[PDB]
Design an enzyme around this catalytic site. Sequence first.
Site, PDB file in Angstrom:
ATOM      1  N   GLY A 160       3.519  -3.024 -52.471  1.00  0.00           N
ATOM      2  CA  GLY A 160       2.284  -2.293 -52.225  1.00  0.00           C
ATOM      3  C   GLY A 160       1.061  -2.947 -52.063  1.00  0.00           C
TER       4      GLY A 160
ATOM      5  CE  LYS B 228       1.393 -10.219 -50.303  1.00  0.00           C
ATOM      6  NZ  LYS B 228       1.834 -11.032 -49.006  1.00  0.00           N
TER       7      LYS B 228
ATOM      8  CG  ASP C   1       8.551 -10.347 -40.083  1.00  0.00           C
ATOM      9  OD1 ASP C   1       9.443  -9.106 -38.711  1.00  0.00           O
ATOM     10  OD2 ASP C   1       8.392  -9.526 -40.535  1.00  0.00           O
TER      11      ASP C   1
ATOM     12  CB  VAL D  91      -3.431  -4.554 -48.233  1.00  0.00           C
ATOM     13  CG1 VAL D  91      -4.820  -6.430 -48.438  1.00  0.00           C
ATOM     14  CG2 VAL D  91      -1.953  -5.747 -48.426  1.00  0.00           C
TER      15      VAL D  91
ATOM     16  CB  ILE E 195      -7.413  -3.399 -46.114  1.00  0.00           C
ATOM     17  CG1 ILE E 195      -8.687  -4.412 -47.330  1.00  0.00           C
ATOM     18  CG2 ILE E 195      -7.360  -4.343 -44.994  1.00  0.00           C
ATOM     19  CD1 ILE E 195      -8.984  -5.032 -46.938  1.00  0.00           C
ATOM     20  N   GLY E 196      -4.253  -1.642 -46.159  1.00  0.00           N
ATOM     21  CA  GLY E 196      -3.334  -1.466 -45.690  1.00  0.00           C
ATOM     22  C   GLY E 196      -2.155  -1.452 -46.831  1.00  0.00           C
TER      23      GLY E 196
ATOM     24  CB  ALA F 199       6.949  -5.989 -48.943  1.00  0.00           C
TER      25      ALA F 199
HETATM   26  C1  LIG Z   1      -3.393  -9.837 -47.864  1.00  0.00           C
HETATM   27  C2  LIG Z   1      -2.558 -10.070 -46.337  1.00  0.00           C
HETATM   28  C3  LIG Z   1      -1.273  -9.531 -46.321  1.00  0.00           C
HETATM   29  C4  LIG Z   1      -0.456  -9.920 -44.864  1.00  0.00           C
HETATM   30  C5  LIG Z   1       1.111 -10.026 -44.592  1.00  0.00           C
HETATM   31  C6  LIG Z   1       0.891  -8.163 -44.348  1.00  0.00           C
HETATM   32  O1  LIG Z   1       0.922  -7.239 -45.646  1.00  0.00           O
HETATM   33  C7  LIG Z   1       0.158  -7.060 -43.076  1.00  0.00           C
HETATM   34  O2  LIG Z   1       0.983  -5.615 -43.044  1.00  0.00           O
HETATM   35  C8  LIG Z   1      -0.214  -7.380 -42.750  1.00  0.00           C
HETATM   36  O3  LIG Z   1      -0.693  -6.149 -41.557  1.00  0.00           O
HETATM   37  C9  LIG Z   1      -1.499  -6.835 -43.955  1.00  0.00           C
HETATM   38  C10 LIG Z   1      -2.116  -5.554 -43.668  1.00  0.00           C
HETATM   39  C11 LIG Z   1      -3.409  -5.828 -44.004  1.00  0.00           C
HETATM   40  O4  LIG Z   1      -4.021  -6.873 -44.342  1.00  0.00           O
HETATM   41  C12 LIG Z   1      -5.343  -7.385 -43.959  1.00  0.00           C
HETATM   42  C13 LIG Z   1      -5.871  -6.546 -42.970  1.00  0.00           C
HETATM   43  C14 LIG Z   1      -7.484  -7.413 -43.060  1.00  0.00           C
HETATM   44  O5  LIG Z   1      -7.988  -6.453 -42.299  1.00  0.00           O
HETATM   45  C15 LIG Z   1      -7.758  -8.652 -43.080  1.00  0.00           C
HETATM   46  C16 LIG Z   1      -6.960  -8.777 -44.130  1.00  0.00           C
HETATM   47  O6  LIG Z   1      -7.816 -10.203 -44.548  1.00  0.00           O
HETATM   48  C17 LIG Z   1      -5.357  -8.832 -44.184  1.00  0.00           C
HETATM   49  C18 LIG Z   1      -5.230  -9.806 -44.927  1.00  0.00           C
HETATM   50  O7  LIG Z   1      -5.393 -10.509 -46.013  1.00  0.00           O
HETATM   51  O8  LIG Z   1      -3.639  -9.492 -45.311  1.00  0.00           O
END
Ligand SMILES: C[C@H]1CCCC(=O)[C@@H](O)[C@@H](O)CCCOc2cc(O)cc(O)c2C(=O)O1
Length: 340
Positions: free
Chosen positions: A27, A44, A139, A29, A21-22, A25
């Site tokens: 690691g 995460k 933030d 996700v 997904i992404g 900080a």
């Molecule tokens: C685990 C949580 C961390 C939140 C904090 C974080 O790291 C940010 O960088 C944010 O941009 C998350 C990027 C991808 O985060 C999701 C995308 C998505 O399509 C659905 C989701 O549920 C999440 C999520 O739960 O992020």
Amino acid sequence: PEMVRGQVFDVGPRYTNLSYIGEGAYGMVCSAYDNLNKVRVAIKKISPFEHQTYCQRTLREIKILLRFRHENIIGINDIIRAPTIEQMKDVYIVQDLMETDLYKLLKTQHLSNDHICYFLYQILRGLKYIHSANVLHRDLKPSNLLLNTTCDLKICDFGLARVADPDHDHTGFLTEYVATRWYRAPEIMLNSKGYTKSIDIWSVGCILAEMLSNRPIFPGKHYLDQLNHILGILGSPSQEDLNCIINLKARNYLLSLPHKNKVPWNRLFPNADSKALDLLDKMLTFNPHKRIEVEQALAHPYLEQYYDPSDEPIAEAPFKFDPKEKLKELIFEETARFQP
Ligand SMILES: C[C@H]1CCCC(=O)[C@@H](O)[C@@H](O)CCCOc2cc(O)cc(O)c2C(=O)O1
């Protein structure tokens, strides 16, 4: 263990069918199928233990989120780590799976005024709970605002959060800072450590402006450029607001600038609701002591369709106050409740 992108993502066997997904900080996700609750979730991965700073960021987030419970704050469903301190190299945080974040949404989708109003209300509703716990998020930005398929909003990432400390907030001119540039209040560059609730309200103001036009209102291109953009729109501070800046280097910097006129909000945003622009102005107020507070913002006429103080709950137990080996040990202790 399930390898993902050439990295160990070891969350089995409860969590399977992993999709990237992404990035967090410390690691990546991933989405995954929760085989117990029969729902897909977000996970995460965190790898903080080699560094004192990363351990702090991880610990404070876990401590805060394990006590917080609010509809507009994404909670921790589960924490995965090894059974012993010797063996624990990574920590996985399991949270609700949302559809998108406001950063991604704003890149391609124009928001209706009804969506802007509902999004803003939920941010402030979540923020009211946070601030009621004597906590600052510090933030807030579109990428930290998650949306599900029915446009319900949840606030994410408390790794930069701090307990409010308004009596120790004063500092010098151009002193270092951590939060994201475009959402940084002007006093951060001038005389503030960011220990007061008003730094969060400024970020929300920046987010509201960005929802109105799908572009950041103060897109500073480096640390020093940020204040240029803010004053370029707000105009020169008044004498009264300058007198509130008693630090001489900060005040004399502002005094050295040529006069700048305020740019009317309704010319920057000719399509925006006039009540939205009135609230925007009150959140993007230069003087933090005059800046609107979260409970006042919720009562603003722009949010009248949603405002209900009895349905905007506050924290039961606010936070009173704030080596890597001790921090790892505390992270291990704080995550013990999610083990068998
Ligand atoms: C685990 C949580 C961390 C939140 C904090 C974080 O790291 C940010 O960088 C944010 O941009 C998350 C990027 C991808 O985060 C999701 C995308 C998505 O399509 C659905 C989701 O549920 C999440 C999520 O739960 O992020």
